[PDB]
């Protein structure tokens, strides 16, 4: 690219205003300097998305009194290291390391780590055939190359046509310094599956098993914490 | 040659009447196979149904409110109260209080779809006409209850609107139409014998990448 880019985080502004005119990119909505060679933390990415200046044009906004099947979205508080703060708030709750609520809403002594993540994808039935071996090798390649996740953290892949499952497992103790967190890889993967790459200049996930493209129709993601949630 | 239930595949059908009779899975209630089944009964079917697929831990968290097997009334509507921990729900079964005098109806639904960018051209006129055709033909919703379609590439919105006073006896409810549509978009047709939604616009097959659904009640939530 002729100008500066941030391959791992398009939610940035890049300037040749760095030392010696080098490229520097800063995160939208927080301002944290971003390492454009590794994944940005989910917390900081959520802050960037909430800060995004939407122009609705002729789209309508949901009413403030409208209900959703989700817990709702929000601009999170992140600590200086980019992690979710354990408490998120005028009403408050505790979250785990992927930002998901793990207590009832009240008025948080630790950030409970999410150490196991189950991603369940149903793809559109297709004439192209593939087996577990193919799927396992391909997802491991994509997690290493696209998300920079070490394959030791892909604990398992399961396949019962047309349902793919990926199990990510990662204890804090298993993480070398700078290792990508499964919680961040899962989030980038989730957004890729919804057709929103968070990368800059890497196209879509474009999942193929034998070069044959798969169309994901339904995504479910389950998060298991190191201590059970307290509802 | 056999009995089917075009509007509800979550049934077992047998020639038992005076005549095909189709009973809902997971409740056994007889089903009217000429109109949409209530979302409440379809959720009970879904919950009453793994090989090498793993099940999530009972302690796993999700980014939604959690799926449950609801209580329905003898007309197949959600009972207003769902339950140890109890709460009130609206007519699409969504919780509207914290954990119930009436079943408050959802009278406006916003469906927000983002489609994959595609080479085939189309515009709002094309989308409006096609989505209105599909909601009448596939989802059996009367035309007046689609209030609006909006398009800012690649986002499509459909607004459904159906006030209690404007819903005739026997009309399909917008909440059931929205549920059938939501499941179709996720690649699960609830119909029997009608294939997929297979959305195509000005001749272009479209792939939906992301669905968001907003429900607005005739009485505001009390949280």
């Amino acid at each position, epitope marked *: *690219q002729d100008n500066c880019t941030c391959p791992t985080n398009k939610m940035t502004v890049c300037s040749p205003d760095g030392p010696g005119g080098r490229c520097q990119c800063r995160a939208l909505g927080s301002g944290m300097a971003v390492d454009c060679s590794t994944l940005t933390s989910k917390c900081l990415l959520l802050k960037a998305r909430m800060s995004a200046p939407k122009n609705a044009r002729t789209l309508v906004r949901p009413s403030e009194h409208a209900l959703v099947d989700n817990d709702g979205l929000y601009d999170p508080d992140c600590d200086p290291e980019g992690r979710f703060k354990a408490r998120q708030c005028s009403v408050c709750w505790c979250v785990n390391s992927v930002g998901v609520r793990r207590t009832d809403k009240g008025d948080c002594d630790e950030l409970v780590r999410t150490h196991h993540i189950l991603i369940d994808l149903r793809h559109r039935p297709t004439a192209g055939a593939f087996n577990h071996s193919d799927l396992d090798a391909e997802l491991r390649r994509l997690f290493r190359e*696209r998300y920079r996740l070490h394959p030791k953290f892909v604990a398992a892949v399961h396949y019962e046509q047309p349902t793919i499952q990926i199990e990510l497992r990662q204890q804090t103790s298993q993480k070398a310094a700078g290792d990508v967190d499964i919680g961040d890889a899962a989030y980038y993967f989730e957004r890729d599956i919804k057709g929103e790459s968070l990368f800059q200049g890497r*196209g879509g996930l*474009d999942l*193929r098993v034998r070069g044959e493209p798969l169309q994901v129709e339904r995504t479910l993601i389950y998060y298991l914490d190191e201590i059970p949630p307290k509802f | 040659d056999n009995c089917t239930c075009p509007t509800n595949k979550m049934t077992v059908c047998s020639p038992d009447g005076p005549r095909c009779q189709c009973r809902a899975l997971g409740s056994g209630m007889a089903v009217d196979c000429s109109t949409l089944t209530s979302k409440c009964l379809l959720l009970k079917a879904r919950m009453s149904a793994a090989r090498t697929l793993v099940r999530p831990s009972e302690h796993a968290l999700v980014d939604n409110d959690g799926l449950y097997d609801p209580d329905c009334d003898p007309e197949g509507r959600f009972k207003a109260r769902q339950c140890s921990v109890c709460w009130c729900v609206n007519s699409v079964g969504v919780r509207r209080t914290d954990k119930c005098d009436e079943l408050v109806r959802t009278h406006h639904i916003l469906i927000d779809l983002r489609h994959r*960018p595609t080479a085939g051209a189309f515009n709002h006129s094309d989308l409006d006409a096609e989505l209105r055709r599909l909601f009448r033909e596939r989802y059996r919703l009367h035309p007046k209850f689609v209030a609006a379609v909006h398009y800012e590439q690649p986002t499509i919105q459909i607004e459904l609107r159906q006030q209690t006073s404007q819903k005739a006896a026997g009309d399909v409810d917008i909440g059931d139409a929205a549920y059938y549509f939501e499941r179709d978009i996720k690649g699960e047709s609830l119909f029997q014998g009608r294939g997929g939604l297979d959305l195509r616009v000005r001749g272009e097959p479209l792939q939906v990448e992301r669905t968001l659904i907003y429900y607005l009640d005739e009485i505001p939530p009390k949280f």
Partner: antibody
Framework: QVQLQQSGSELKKPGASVKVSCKASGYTFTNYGMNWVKQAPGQGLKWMGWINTYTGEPTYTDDFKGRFAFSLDTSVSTAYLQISSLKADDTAVYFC??????????????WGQGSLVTVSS | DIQLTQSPSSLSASVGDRVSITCKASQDVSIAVAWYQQKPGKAPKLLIYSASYRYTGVPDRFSGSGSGTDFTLTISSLQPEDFAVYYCQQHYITPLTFGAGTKVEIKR
């Protein structure tokens, strides 16, 4: 019998235009991107850009834009390379090469045989 | 653009020799490096993608390694059909770029 078949050699005067075709057969054309690679006589490979056959959108590079145009006719599974205002340094073999739509598939598994374009007065 | 420094520009080897060709990227490209072989008058053939994955039908003697900035294509035992030009390519980000090529020639 997955194949890309390109059009034949071309000889053009400076200032002229040329259109090179790349016909796909044996696979679903809109499931893959089509990439264009230049190889001047005696030189190495240079990526010119590509066209997303599903969205129809071309992506050019700094060195190949303006008078280079990538287009498609999906009804006959064909991608085209048009070069206008030809100059002698355009003399080269042009390859089309199939790839995917995202970076973990942006390597080229199936290639055309190449089309030689020679520009001379 | 990501510059690839491919070395050596040429090498002479005998049938039976272990041959290694390196590709240095000007910035970290994960494992997204492909290698191609090209003979005279022919299109290039894909050998390796994602730094170490052999493409269908590519013989076992071709292998790839590396991550980050430094990559290596290895021919574990050169065979008579392997004298050719080899190219690396990065597929980390657009624009896609190539190394300048390595000509593998017959030693005598």
């Amino acid at each position: 019998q997955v194949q890309l078949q390109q059009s034949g050699s071309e000889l053009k005067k400076p200032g002229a235009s040329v259109k090179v075709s790349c016909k796909a057969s044996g696979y679903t054309f809109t499931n893959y991107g089509m990439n264009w690679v230049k190889q001047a006589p005696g030189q190495g490979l240079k990526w010119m850009g590509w066209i997303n056959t599903y969205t129809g959108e071309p992506t050019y590079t700094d060195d190949f834009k303006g008078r280079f145009a990538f287009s498609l006719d999906t009804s006959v599974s064909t991608a085209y390379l048009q070069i206008s205002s030809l100059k002698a340094d355009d003399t080269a073999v042009y390859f089309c090469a199939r790839g995917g739509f995202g970076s973990s598939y942006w390597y080229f598994d199936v290639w055309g045989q190449g089309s030689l374009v020679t520009v001379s007065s | 653009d990501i510059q690839l420094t491919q070395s050596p520009s040429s090498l002479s080897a005998s049938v039976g020799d272990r041959v290694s060709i390196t590709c240095k990227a000007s910035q970290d490209v994960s494992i997204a490096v492909a290698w191609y072989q090209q003979k005279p008058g022919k299109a290039p053939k894909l050998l390796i993608y994602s730094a170490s994955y052999r493409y269908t039908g590519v013989p076992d003697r071709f292998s790839g390694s590396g991550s980050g900035t430094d990559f290596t294509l290895t021919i574990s035992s050169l065979q008579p059909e392997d004298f050719a030009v080899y190219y690396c390519q990065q597929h980390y980000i657009t624009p896609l770029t190539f190394g300048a090529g390595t000509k593998v020639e017959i030693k005598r």
